[PDB]
Amino acid sequence: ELSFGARAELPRIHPVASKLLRLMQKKETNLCLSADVSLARELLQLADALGPSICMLKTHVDILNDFTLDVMKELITLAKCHEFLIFEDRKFADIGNTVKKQYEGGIFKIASWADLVNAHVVPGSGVVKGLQEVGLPLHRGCLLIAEMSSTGSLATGDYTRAAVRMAEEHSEFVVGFISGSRVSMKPEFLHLTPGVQLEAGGDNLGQQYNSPQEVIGKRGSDIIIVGRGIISAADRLEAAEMYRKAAWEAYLSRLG
Amino acid sequence: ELSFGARAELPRIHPVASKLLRLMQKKETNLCLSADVSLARELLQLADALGPSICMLKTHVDILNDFTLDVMKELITLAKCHEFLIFEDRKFADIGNTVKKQYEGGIFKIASWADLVNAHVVPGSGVVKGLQEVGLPLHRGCLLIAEMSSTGSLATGDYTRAAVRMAEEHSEFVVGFISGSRVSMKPEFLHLTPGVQLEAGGDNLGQQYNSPQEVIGKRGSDIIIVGRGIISAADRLEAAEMYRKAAWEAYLSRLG
Numbered sequence A, B: 001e002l003s004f005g006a007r008a009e010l011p012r013i014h015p016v017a018s019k020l021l022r023l024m025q026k027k028e029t030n031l032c033l034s035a036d037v038s039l040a041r042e043l044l045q046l047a048d049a050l051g052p053s054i055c056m057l058k059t060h061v062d063i064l065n066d067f068t069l070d071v072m073k074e075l076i077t078l079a080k081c082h083e084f085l086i087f088e089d090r091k092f093a094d095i096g097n098t099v100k101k102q103y104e105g106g107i108f109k110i111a112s113w114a115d116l117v118n119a120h121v122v123p124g125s126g127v128v129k130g131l132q133e134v135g136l137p138l139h140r141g142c143l144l145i146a147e148m149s150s151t152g153s154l155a156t157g158d159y160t161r162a163a164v165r166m167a168e169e170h171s172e173f174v175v176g177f178i179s180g181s182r183v184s185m186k187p188e189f190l191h192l193t194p195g196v197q198l199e200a201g202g203d204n205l206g207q208q209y210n211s212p213q214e215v216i217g218k219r220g221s222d223i224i225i226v227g228r229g230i231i232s233a234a235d236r237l238e239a240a241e242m243y244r245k246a247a248w249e250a251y252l253s254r255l256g
């Protein structure tokens, strides 16, 4: 098993994955903050304070009450300053012809500011083809949703295998997965795992939690995605540091 | 098999489905226009001219370059004038806690103007639970995506059966399906079918077309969803009338 720094140099590595893996090793962080807030001021204050602790900031641009492309300009300034990627968790899931417009255009112009986006594989490979026609020219990457954290997820068995095949057949653009575990045996592919908290539990709408030690250490994922475990805490900086140290040590102990 | 007008009166019918079925029978239309345009002025000019020919106008609010809630105010005026429902084809596909915010909030405030939305079933029933916590109080309906039109779709076999079970267990909010065919044997549930053109063919990004006669007449669906077959035509009114007459006669001939 290679370190993040060595994976950053693999011959078939995507440039976006390489950039991410380099800053993960430099900063000793495999934490992605899920910045699930409705106010631009809170998003930017979290990005600035937690920037040093995170490899990635995950957005849902469509829950931000005061979105403007200028807010995303300020977010890019912080991403460059503190060295993290921006991941818009848009979960594209339409025919190729539709998703290309949803990615490039409308009010959000996601491709103009998002290093990474993600897509569901249920529509077939056209979803990836459509996205890549915008994303390849704009030097972007994509994650495929191979497994989900929620109760009753149908992303199991042959579905997960189809996501892995689709990623591997589109390595020019697909840099990894949303998954609960290592699903690809190819080390060029990032595994990002949501549904993470230090304590056992869930929410009232089907979210299920596992610990950083379980998903990084036992299940072999690379990056934890954490929302409420940080966002709902009083001291979001110390919460982020707890999650960072947990995920980083789990990673180191799997390396041996 | 019951007429649309008789289905509108079924004991377990959802009010949104009833409203739709009534205006389908009154206007002799089972055509949903896929208004896949980037300009508000073109969206509103299509809604006004084609309003009399359609039971429903399907939006992708996130490809509209000049979206404002005022554009949707003008669209509602046309929907009320000409009697059609507004369907935002958002394809919600996240955990319940996320989709409730994506449905109610952000810039688009989808639930404030959309009669109908749709959701993927891959995350499990939490996606429906989250949406229904916004949509039930706002007297809205939802369609579940049971089958897709695109090449390589994984929405087959047990997946389609899971979508039908989920719809039937959430009949307070779920009024039907995006599907290629009749998937539910319960007549209270609408079947809407995209991937429709009069001529054989497809697009370059995995879209596949079938005719109105095939999907309404042979496959037993209720409503055709048509984008480019109308939108790319020179005379979009006559194109809409051709699709309306095709879908309506296919429906009548299945009734006998």
Ligand SMILES: O=C(O)c1cc(=O)[nH]c(=O)n1[C@@H]1O[C@H](COP(=O)(O)O)[C@@H](O)[C@H]1O
Pocket (backbone or CB within 6 Å): A034, A036, A058, A060, A089, A118, A147, A148, A149, A150, A178, A194, A195, A196, A207, A225, A226, A227, A228, A229, B094, B095, B098
């Ligand atoms: O793509 C994702 O990040 C995602 C996939 C998934 O399987 N589960 C999942 O929870 N998410 C997202 O990750 C975040 C989880 O947030 P918390 O439950 O607050 O930690 C939310 O923004 C979800 O939308």
Ligand SMILES: O=C(O)c1cc(=O)[nH]c(=O)n1[C@@H]1O[C@H](COP(=O)(O)O)[C@@H](O)[C@H]1O
Pocket (backbone or CB within 6 Å): A094, A095, A098, B034, B036, B058, B060, B089, B118, B147, B148, B149, B150, B178, B194, B195, B196, B207, B225, B226, B227, B228, B229
């Ligand atoms: O939910 C949908 O409407 C949808 C589901 C699906 O399986 N296939 C599909 O084509 N659609 C949508 O229906 C429209 C099809 O447009 P045309 O291919 O131009 O007729 C697009 O806006 C798609 O996003």
